[PDB]
Amino acid sequence: ILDEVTHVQDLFLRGAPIRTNIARNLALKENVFMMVICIELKIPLFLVGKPGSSKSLAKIIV
């Protein structure tokens, strides 16, 4: 299940334009994948954290 989830996250990140000098950590992948899904389904997303949690970056890439 974990492998399938990370595979879909990598797939969705691949769908987004390739960005150089950007980290493929679980943060960015999960953020972008879940915001794509949530705004697709009209369900709210509430990303939080601290400076460096790939939330605004995920917003811009989406």
Ligand X SMILES: Nc1ncnc2c1ncn2[C@@H]1O[C@H](COP(=O)(O)OP(=O)(O)O)[C@@H](O)[C@H]1O
Give the footprint of ligand X on this chain (CB under 6 A).
22-23, 25, 27-28, 51-57
How close are the terminal C-alpha atoms of the chain, in Å?
25
State the nearest-atom distance from the C-beta of 53 to ligand X, in Å: 5
- Within 13 Å, how many C-alpha atoms sit on residue 50's CB side? 0
The residue among 1 and 22 lying less far from ligand X, judged by its C-beta, is: 22
Q: Among all residues, whose Cβ is closest to ligand X?
A: 23
State the nearest-atom distance from the C-beta of 24 to ligand X, in Å: 7
> How far does CA 11 lie from the centroid of its chain?
11
